[PDB]
């Protein structure tokens, strides 16, 4: 369950490697454990345009489906952003965990 450390007021990049054949054709999402893991942002609904950056407030997501890497950007990282999060692979109504991330905010 990986640790990503960032400087406060700067953009923190979170990277989630995944098996690109096993998760072929699947949309991804980023969520924050609140309890339940609640949806922050997801990749483009059109899987062939997953490379396109999608924003939700101060979080962005982009997916490189060929290389099998999902990147999340926490813009303007604030101490209130520290906590547990998940990269997930979507399919049907299910979500599989690609990676569990702890975010920490320095100073």
Ligand X SMILES: *[C@@H]1O[C@H](CO)[C@@H](O)[C@H](O)[C@H]1NC(C)=O
Please report, as ranges, the residues that interact with its own copies according to CB under 8 A. 2-4, 7, 9-11, 13, 15, 17, 20-22, 24-25, 44-45, 51-58, 60, 62, 64, 66-69, 71, 73, 75-76
Last residue before each break in the chain (C–N > 2.5 Å)? 34
Q: Which range of residues in 9-17, 19-27, 79-87, 92-100 is near ligand PSF by CB under 6 A?
A: 19-27
Q: Are strands 94-105 and 2-6 parallel, antiparallel or unpaired?
A: parallel
By CB under 6 A, the residues from 28 to 57 that bind ligand X are 32, 38-42, 54, 56-57
By CB under 6 A, the residues from 56 to 85 that bind ligand PSF are 65-66
7 binds ligand PSF (CB under 6 A): no
Q: Which two tokens stand for residue 56?
A: 């939700």
Strands (E), 1-107: 2-6, 12-17, 28-33, 37-42, 54-56, 59-64, 69-74, 83-91, 94-105
14 binds ligand X (CB under 6 A): no
Residue 33 near residue 84 (C-beta atoms within 8 A): yes
Q: Which residues bind ligand PSF (CB under 6 A)?
A: 20-21, 24, 44-46, 49, 52, 65-66
């Amino acid at each position: 369950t990986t640790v990503f450390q960032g400087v406060a007021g700067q953009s923190l990049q979170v990277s989630c490697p995944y098996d690109s054949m096993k998760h072929w054709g699947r949309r991804k999402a980023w969520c924050r454990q609140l309890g339940p893991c609640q949806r922050v942002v997801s990749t483009h609904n059109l899987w062939l345009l997953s490379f396109l950056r999608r924003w939700n407030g101060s979080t962005a997501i982009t997916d490189d489906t060929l290389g099998g890497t999902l990147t999340i950007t926490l813009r303007n990282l604030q101490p209130h952003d520290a906590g547990l999060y998940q990269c997930q692979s979507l399919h049907g109504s299910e979500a599989d965990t690609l990676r569990k991330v702890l975010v920490e905010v320095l100073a």
